[PDB]
Symmetry: C3
Subunit: 131 residues, 3 copies
């Protein structure tokens, strides 16, 4: 089973919402959906995910981006700079997933930079083991 | 051989010490030990590790977190902000390990945020190849 | 096929150039070349890469580091701090590569810290799937 994806944000996002990474570069298995921003598991197993979300510079001082499995937070990150500089909220996880499980990044608050085609803000993952 | 782990810090750590990540989410192979903070290799091979350690905000300006293999530093990271903002010391490695080799993250100095169940500060790794 | 590498920067780099990571720790497959700073694919397939580039502290406020596939940017990152503190430009990708494809990190501008043997600034990658 080949499952591996990588997407850039493209569009700026601000405020509480799912980050819908819309510049999809790689998507083996077709399990990442840019319309919803969710990776949906169809092969149960253990997966690696990582994300790097760039806080917009020049306007705002804090930004929170968390990785979720279904309802639940499984990693948290903050970017913060009192001078309103660009900075990243990034983290990585390894999670076991059942078929139907959704994994996605949520913006808790603050402003994420959408870098158009530049892929400043990213979300990727792949299956390590199949059950 | 299935070896893959992911743990959050949970408890705040400050000053020189091994970071004992105590919120263990995934631990295929049972090779990560929260009591010691160490991953101990039992299957010789080549491994990926990554860590993301959040510096506490509101008190302190620098924090250093390094990945060690046995005695030796194999990656270094610093978080620094003169306004005492949250920021991350993060890095990633690929290392060959022999049976008995220990891999762990050490706090060299500064204050790491323990995010309780929020998994702000993290350590993960998995085997890529078995010898 | 075993392909997996990890290298530290070692030497300081400043201004537009390819980052030639010269402290090579792991290099299964011998596909990373410190002389050029490039990973060259010989086994077509899908690959994971990550990089963590530390901006020098005490002199300068911004630094840009991008991952390239051949001519083209496939991930971008910025480090920025108005007080001239250390900060990281980091990102991760998953890319399909054909034989002959080159992957490397370019410094677009600013000053990257070469940490000698300390491995503050790093580049790693491995093959997930072979075609
Ligand atoms: Cl793998
Ligand atoms: Cl100031
Ligand atoms: Mg949160
Ligand atoms: Mg150190
Ligand atoms: Mg650029
Ligand atoms: Ni910062
Ligand atoms: Ni700052």
């Amino acid at each position: 089973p080949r499952v591996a994806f990588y997407a850039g944000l493209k569009n700026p996002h601000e405020g509480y919402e799912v980050l819908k990474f819309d510049d999809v570069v790689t998507n083996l298995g077709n399990n990442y959906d840019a319309a919803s921003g969710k990776f949906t598991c169809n092969i149960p197993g253990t997966y690696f995910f990582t994300y790097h979300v760039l806080m917009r510079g020049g306007d705002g001082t804090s930004m929170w981006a968390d990785l979720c499995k279904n309802g639940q937070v499984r990693a948290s990150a903050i970017a913060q700079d009192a001078d309103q500089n660009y900075d990243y909220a990034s983290n990585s996880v390894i999670l076991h997933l059942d078929a139907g499980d959704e994994v996605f990044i949520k913006l808790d608050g603050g402003k994420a930079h959408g870098g158009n085609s530049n892929k400043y803000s990213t979300f990727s993952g792949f299956i390590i083991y199949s059950d």
